[PDB]
């Protein structure tokens, strides 16, 4: 009989300004990274929105949910530490050495990815 088989492949292109945290996090899971990163994005939003306000240089996170799925999670801890954060006891502190311009640049990737994962035909 007639025999014959083939294969395929992909290229890859979408990352605006790099995205190391995305790749490192993806090592765990797509859905997990999206949610695990979502929280980090929201926290950075405050600093990015009001970087001059030293009062917003800190991020409260006493929610037991964080200690349940955010601390022991592989990717989130390294993400904040690598990006430019400080793991506290009850809340996280924003290092003055951290680059807000960089956080936003990379944050844009997750911001758009959030809606891309929804695929529910809608916006924020």
PDB file of C-alpha atoms in Angstrom:
ATOM      1  CA  UNK A   1       0.000   0.000   0.000  1.00  0.00           C
ATOM      2  CA  UNK A   2       0.873   3.710  -0.270  1.00  0.00           C
ATOM      3  CA  UNK A   3       3.248   4.703   2.530  1.00  0.00           C
ATOM      4  CA  UNK A   4       4.319   8.216   3.473  1.00  0.00           C
ATOM      5  CA  UNK A   5       4.593  10.512   6.484  1.00  0.00           C
ATOM      6  CA  UNK A   6       5.794  14.033   7.284  1.00  0.00           C
ATOM      7  CA  UNK A   7       6.064  16.564  10.111  1.00  0.00           C
ATOM      8  CA  UNK A   8       5.909  20.277  10.920  1.00  0.00           C
ATOM      9  CA  UNK A   9       7.358  23.001  13.143  1.00  0.00           C
ATOM     10  CA  UNK A  10       7.047  26.590  14.364  1.00  0.00           C
ATOM     11  CA  UNK A  11       8.994  29.856  14.333  1.00  0.00           C
ATOM     12  CA  UNK A  12       8.105  32.115  17.246  1.00  0.00           C
ATOM     13  CA  UNK A  13       7.629  35.879  17.380  1.00  0.00           C
ATOM     14  CA  UNK A  14       5.645  38.163  19.685  1.00  0.00           C
ATOM     15  CA  UNK A  15       7.866  39.187  22.600  1.00  0.00           C
ATOM     16  CA  UNK A  16       8.115  42.981  22.510  1.00  0.00           C
ATOM     17  CA  UNK A  17      11.122  43.732  24.716  1.00  0.00           C
ATOM     18  CA  UNK A  18      12.475  40.352  25.817  1.00  0.00           C
ATOM     19  CA  UNK A  19      10.803  38.192  28.464  1.00  0.00           C
ATOM     20  CA  UNK A  20      13.138  36.049  30.607  1.00  0.00           C
ATOM     21  CA  UNK A  21      10.720  35.839  33.535  1.00  0.00           C
ATOM     22  CA  UNK A  22       8.086  34.404  31.197  1.00  0.00           C
ATOM     23  CA  UNK A  23      10.365  31.618  29.969  1.00  0.00           C
ATOM     24  CA  UNK A  24      11.671  30.768  33.439  1.00  0.00           C
ATOM     25  CA  UNK A  25       8.118  30.703  34.798  1.00  0.00           C
ATOM     26  CA  UNK A  26       6.794  28.704  31.846  1.00  0.00           C
ATOM     27  CA  UNK A  27       9.116  25.955  33.081  1.00  0.00           C
ATOM     28  CA  UNK A  28       6.390  25.212  35.627  1.00  0.00           C
ATOM     29  CA  UNK A  29       3.078  25.792  33.849  1.00  0.00           C
ATOM     30  CA  UNK A  30       1.286  28.212  31.486  1.00  0.00           C
ATOM     31  CA  UNK A  31      -1.882  28.673  33.540  1.00  0.00           C
ATOM     32  CA  UNK A  32       0.102  28.691  36.786  1.00  0.00           C
ATOM     33  CA  UNK A  33       2.552  31.303  35.504  1.00  0.00           C
ATOM     34  CA  UNK A  34      -0.262  33.502  34.192  1.00  0.00           C
ATOM     35  CA  UNK A  35      -2.002  33.574  37.574  1.00  0.00           C
ATOM     36  CA  UNK A  36       1.199  33.517  39.627  1.00  0.00           C
ATOM     37  CA  UNK A  37       2.449  36.449  37.551  1.00  0.00           C
ATOM     38  CA  UNK A  38      -0.896  38.260  37.568  1.00  0.00           C
ATOM     39  CA  UNK A  39      -0.480  39.130  41.248  1.00  0.00           C
ATOM     40  CA  UNK A  40       3.032  40.473  40.663  1.00  0.00           C
ATOM     41  CA  UNK A  41       1.713  42.614  37.809  1.00  0.00           C
ATOM     42  CA  UNK A  42      -0.993  44.187  39.971  1.00  0.00           C
ATOM     43  CA  UNK A  43       1.545  44.972  42.690  1.00  0.00           C
ATOM     44  CA  UNK A  44       3.877  46.662  40.206  1.00  0.00           C
ATOM     45  CA  UNK A  45       0.937  48.658  38.847  1.00  0.00           C
ATOM     46  CA  UNK A  46       0.797  50.610  42.109  1.00  0.00           C
ATOM     47  CA  UNK A  47       4.489  51.515  41.992  1.00  0.00           C
ATOM     48  CA  UNK A  48       4.330  52.253  38.264  1.00  0.00           C
ATOM     49  CA  UNK A  49       1.221  54.400  38.709  1.00  0.00           C
ATOM     50  CA  UNK A  50       2.749  56.313  41.621  1.00  0.00           C
ATOM     51  CA  UNK A  51       6.533  55.736  41.658  1.00  0.00           C
ATOM     52  CA  UNK A  52       7.085  59.125  43.296  1.00  0.00           C
ATOM     53  CA  UNK A  53       4.829  58.210  46.218  1.00  0.00           C
ATOM     54  CA  UNK A  54       7.191  56.543  48.689  1.00  0.00           C
ATOM     55  CA  UNK A  55       4.087  55.511  50.633  1.00  0.00           C
ATOM     56  CA  UNK A  56       3.317  53.079  47.812  1.00  0.00           C
ATOM     57  CA  UNK A  57       6.848  51.668  47.870  1.00  0.00           C
ATOM     58  CA  UNK A  58       5.456  48.707  49.811  1.00  0.00           C
ATOM     59  CA  UNK A  59       2.951  45.985  48.938  1.00  0.00           C
ATOM     60  CA  UNK A  60       0.750  44.330  51.562  1.00  0.00           C
ATOM     61  CA  UNK A  61       0.148  40.599  51.130  1.00  0.00           C
ATOM     62  CA  UNK A  62      -1.252  39.042  54.291  1.00  0.00           C
ATOM     63  CA  UNK A  63      -3.800  36.989  52.365  1.00  0.00           C
ATOM     64  CA  UNK A  64      -3.350  33.345  53.350  1.00  0.00           C
ATOM     65  CA  UNK A  65      -3.775  32.576  49.651  1.00  0.00           C
ATOM     66  CA  UNK A  66      -0.330  34.068  49.034  1.00  0.00           C
ATOM     67  CA  UNK A  67       1.362  31.718  51.501  1.00  0.00           C
ATOM     68  CA  UNK A  68      -0.649  28.843  50.034  1.00  0.00           C
ATOM     69  CA  UNK A  69       0.030  29.565  46.364  1.00  0.00           C
ATOM     70  CA  UNK A  70       2.659  32.256  45.788  1.00  0.00           C
ATOM     71  CA  UNK A  71       5.526  31.670  48.218  1.00  0.00           C
ATOM     72  CA  UNK A  72       6.326  27.956  47.759  1.00  0.00           C
ATOM     73  CA  UNK A  73       5.542  28.416  44.064  1.00  0.00           C
ATOM     74  CA  UNK A  74       8.512  27.954  41.734  1.00  0.00           C
ATOM     75  CA  UNK A  75       8.868  31.026  39.539  1.00  0.00           C
ATOM     76  CA  UNK A  76       7.100  33.768  41.478  1.00  0.00           C
ATOM     77  CA  UNK A  77       9.790  34.121  44.144  1.00  0.00           C
ATOM     78  CA  UNK A  78      12.580  34.185  41.559  1.00  0.00           C
ATOM     79  CA  UNK A  79      10.500  36.526  39.399  1.00  0.00           C
ATOM     80  CA  UNK A  80      10.225  39.221  42.069  1.00  0.00           C
ATOM     81  CA  UNK A  81      13.814  38.767  43.244  1.00  0.00           C
ATOM     82  CA  UNK A  82      15.102  38.848  39.666  1.00  0.00           C
ATOM     83  CA  UNK A  83      12.838  41.718  38.612  1.00  0.00           C
ATOM     84  CA  UNK A  84      13.609  43.819  41.673  1.00  0.00           C
ATOM     85  CA  UNK A  85      11.631  43.116  44.837  1.00  0.00           C
ATOM     86  CA  UNK A  86      12.091  42.083  48.469  1.00  0.00           C
ATOM     87  CA  UNK A  87      10.314  39.131  50.080  1.00  0.00           C
ATOM     88  CA  UNK A  88       9.085  40.171  53.513  1.00  0.00           C
ATOM     89  CA  UNK A  89       7.276  38.433  56.362  1.00  0.00           C
ATOM     90  CA  UNK A  90       3.787  39.883  55.914  1.00  0.00           C
ATOM     91  CA  UNK A  91       4.358  42.268  53.007  1.00  0.00           C
ATOM     92  CA  UNK A  92       6.832  42.895  50.185  1.00  0.00           C
ATOM     93  CA  UNK A  93       9.028  45.989  49.906  1.00  0.00           C
ATOM     94  CA  UNK A  94       9.999  47.721  46.665  1.00  0.00           C
ATOM     95  CA  UNK A  95      13.773  48.271  46.321  1.00  0.00           C
ATOM     96  CA  UNK A  96      14.855  51.763  45.277  1.00  0.00           C
ATOM     97  CA  UNK A  97      17.391  50.023  43.038  1.00  0.00           C
ATOM     98  CA  UNK A  98      14.610  48.408  41.007  1.00  0.00           C
ATOM     99  CA  UNK A  99      13.981  49.910  37.570  1.00  0.00           C
ATOM    100  CA  UNK A 100      10.352  50.959  37.116  1.00  0.00           C
ATOM    101  CA  UNK A 101      10.930  51.374  33.380  1.00  0.00           C
ATOM    102  CA  UNK A 102      12.012  47.735  33.146  1.00  0.00           C
ATOM    103  CA  UNK A 103       9.160  46.427  35.296  1.00  0.00           C
ATOM    104  CA  UNK A 104       6.613  48.092  33.016  1.00  0.00           C
ATOM    105  CA  UNK A 105       8.351  46.934  29.838  1.00  0.00           C
ATOM    106  CA  UNK A 106       8.132  43.306  30.951  1.00  0.00           C
ATOM    107  CA  UNK A 107       4.800  43.839  32.706  1.00  0.00           C
ATOM    108  CA  UNK A 108       3.280  44.679  29.320  1.00  0.00           C
ATOM    109  CA  UNK A 109       3.896  41.091  28.218  1.00  0.00           C
ATOM    110  CA  UNK A 110       1.807  39.683  31.066  1.00  0.00           C
ATOM    111  CA  UNK A 111      -0.814  42.417  30.718  1.00  0.00           C
ATOM    112  CA  UNK A 112      -1.559  41.395  27.131  1.00  0.00           C
ATOM    113  CA  UNK A 113      -1.097  37.687  27.847  1.00  0.00           C
ATOM    114  CA  UNK A 114      -3.780  37.924  30.532  1.00  0.00           C
ATOM    115  CA  UNK A 115      -6.453  38.794  27.967  1.00  0.00           C
ATOM    116  CA  UNK A 116      -4.958  36.406  25.411  1.00  0.00           C
ATOM    117  CA  UNK A 117      -5.546  33.535  27.837  1.00  0.00           C
ATOM    118  CA  UNK A 118      -9.155  34.612  28.388  1.00  0.00           C
ATOM    119  CA  UNK A 119     -10.194  34.352  24.738  1.00  0.00           C
ATOM    120  CA  UNK A 120     -13.647  35.380  25.922  1.00  0.00           C
ATOM    121  CA  UNK A 121     -13.949  38.163  23.356  1.00  0.00           C
ATOM    122  CA  UNK A 122     -13.673  41.106  25.748  1.00  0.00           C
ATOM    123  CA  UNK A 123     -11.341  43.576  27.461  1.00  0.00           C
ATOM    124  CA  UNK A 124     -10.362  44.808  30.925  1.00  0.00           C
TER     125      UNK A 124
END
